[PDB]
């Protein structure tokens, strides 16, 4: 069930690379066999002394593993039969149908939920449409907060990469906790009285739907071309921040295709347009991804740091400590170029270059045991600890307005 049958026999490997020859063996592998990179996003993003997580087709696992053995590369099999892990994602004990904050929800469900949560809490939540996807779906934005004059705002989005299902789940949990605890908990009451939070539960709606209907591991948008038969752009390489200069692909068929132009995707244009329009009120930009348990700040497109990088490092350090306090979960943090790898076109860098001084990417659980297939039974714990981190950051921003 749940499309797991399609992944029978597939495996996810973790390979250690220590030098360029190790990396060139994976590159050669990728060039002759169909490899779905999980972490990093692409062969061009692999560094010396790092690990690489990737999914292999059933008919190719022997080949891959024999290359790994022959070249005597250190590796492990993270997942030996992907079918079982795909099916085991759906392990909620929630007894009920329809939306749940402790299940992964289909888009029609999330869409109906955005309307229902706004109707039921009209003093704290309003919904708007900030644009339309390539396929024609309305892109909803929730504004969370008690009405006030000239309020500062925090912008938080989820669902850039279609297969990263824990990210939209987190955006929903945030709204859950806002509604559940406003007026009962003074910190949340003050945060929502003093700030607006714009929460975008799924940006890449077309891709998200696709992961439920046809291709669980799809990540890009679903835009087509009149010429190429390839589909989709990587939304987090599509922003106007050193656009496509490094760590992205110009080939429409690659998973890290930067698009035919900056802001070519209707979805990223809608986001960028909104932030341009609300620039004088937005004081922080937070973008939610998975997996690997990191908190990243600019810059990713370049080996340079912002004026306030020491501030960002201290705030990240304190935030990940707050996060760990609940369930012990360990995050790493730092500037993207050196913590992860240089890559252009990211919304976090773009936002920061627009003058939004607090800009962070969060990569949620886990660290590869399940990867994108993080079970429903971990949604609550993941979201609880993440919520502590977002509250910490928001409270900081309130003390450091500008």
Q: Which residues are catalytic?
A: 363
DSSP assignment, residue 43? G
SS3 254: coil
Smallest distance from Zn ion to CB 238, Å: 13
Residue whose CB is less far from Zn ion, 182 or 210 = 210
Strand partners, 56: 11, 35
CB of 306 to Zn ion, least distance (A): 22
Give, as one character, the DSSP assignment of residue 297.
Answer: E
The answer on whether 291 is annotated among ligand-binding residues is yes
| Shortest distance in whole angstroms from residue 234 CB to Zn ion | 9
Of 117 and 364, the one with the shorter C-beta distance to Zn ion is: 364
Classify residue 364 by burial, with Cβ atoms within 10 Å: 0-12, 13-18, 19+. Answer: buried
Distance separating alpha carbons of residues 67 and 84, to the nearest angstrom: 25
User: Is 75 known to sit in a ligand binding site?
Assistant: no
102 is in an annotated binding site: no
| Residues with Cβ within 8 Å of residue 324, at least 6 apart in sequence | 330, 331, 385
Euclidean distance between CA atoms 67 and 65, whole angstroms: 5
- How far is Cα 110 from Cα 23, in angstroms, rounded to an integer? 40
- Which residue number, 100 or 221, has a Cβ lying nearer to Zn ion? 221
Whether the CB-CB separation of 165 and 211 falls below 8 Å is answered with yes
Rounded least distance, CB 289 to Zn ion, Å: 3
Cβ distance to Zn ion smaller for residue 196 or 206: 206
How far apart, in whole angstroms, are the C-alpha atoms of residue 9 and residue 96? 32
Binding site for Zn ion (CB under 5 A): 161, 164, 289
Q: 161 labelled as ligand-binding? A: yes
Q: How far is the CB of 160 from Zn ion (least distance, A)?
A: 5
Number of C-beta neighbours around residue 387 at 10 A: 20
Q: Of the candidates 146, 129, 253, which has an alpha carbon nearest to the alpha carbon of residue 192?
A: 146
Q: 341 a known binding residue?
A: yes
CB 295 within 8 A of CB 329: no
Residue 163 counted as an annotated binding residue:
yes
Of residues 55 and 161, the one with the C-beta less far from Zn ion? 161
Per the annotation, does 190 bind a ligand?
A: no
Nearest-10 crossing angle of helices 61-70, 20-32: 160
Rounded Cα distance, 278 and 313, in Å: 26
Binding residues for substrate: 161-164, 219, 236-237, 290-291, 341
Binding-site members for Zn(2+) are 161, 164, 289
- The annotation places the binding site at 161-164, 219, 236-237, 289-291, 341
């Amino acid at each position: 069930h749940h499309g797991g049958e399609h992944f029978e026999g597939e495996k996810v490997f973790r390979v250690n690379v220590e030098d360029e020859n190790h990396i060139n063996i994976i590159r050669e592998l990728a060039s002759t066999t169909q490899i779905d990179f999980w972490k990093p996003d692409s062969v061009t993003q692999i560094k010396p002394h790092s690990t690489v997580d990737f999914r292999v087709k059933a008919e190719d696992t022997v080949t891959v593993e024999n290359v790994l053995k022959q070249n005597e590369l250190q590796y492990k099999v993270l997942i030996s039969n992907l079918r079982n892990v795909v099916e085991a994602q759906f392990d909620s004990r929630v007894r009920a149908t329809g939306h749940s904050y402790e299940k992964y929800n289909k888009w029609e469900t999330i869409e109906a939920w955005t309307q229902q949560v706004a109707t039921e809490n009209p003093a704290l939540i309003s919904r708007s449409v900030i644009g339309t996807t390539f396929e024609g779906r309305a892109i909803y934005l929730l504004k969370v907060g008690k009405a006030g004059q000239n309020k500062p705002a925090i912008f938080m989005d989820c669902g850039f990469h279609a297969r990263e299902w824990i990210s939209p789940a987190f955006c929903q949990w945030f709204v859950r906790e806002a509604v559940r605890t406003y007026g009962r908990e003074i910190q949340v009451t003050e945060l929502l009285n003093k700030l607006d939070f714009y929460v975008l539960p799924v940006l890449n709606i077309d891709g998200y739907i696709y992961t439920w209907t046809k291709s669980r591991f799809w990540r890009k948008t679903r835009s087509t071309h009149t010429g190429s038969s390839c589909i989709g752009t990587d939304p987090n390489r599509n922003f106007d921040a050193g656009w496509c200069e490094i760590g992205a692909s110009r080939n429409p068929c690659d998973e890290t295709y930067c698009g035919p132009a900056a802001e070519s995707e209707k979805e990223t244009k809608a986001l960028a347009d909104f932030i341009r329009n609300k620039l004088s009120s937005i004081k922080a930009y937070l973008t939610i991804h998975s997996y690997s348990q990191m908190m990243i700040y600019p810059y990713s497109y370049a080996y340079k740091l912002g004026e306030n990088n020491a501030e960002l490092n201290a705030l990240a350090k304190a935030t990940v400590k707050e996060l760990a306090s609940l369930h012990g979960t360990k995050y790493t943090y730092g500037p993207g170029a050196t913590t992860i790898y240089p890559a252009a076109g990211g919304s976090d860098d773009w936002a920061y270059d627009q003058g939004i001084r607090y800009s962070f990417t969060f990569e949620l659980r886990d660290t590869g045991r399940y990867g994108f297939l993080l079970p429903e039974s971990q949604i609550r714990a993941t979201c609880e600890e993440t919520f502590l981190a977002i509250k910490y950051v928001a409270s900081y921003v309130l003390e450091h307005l500008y």
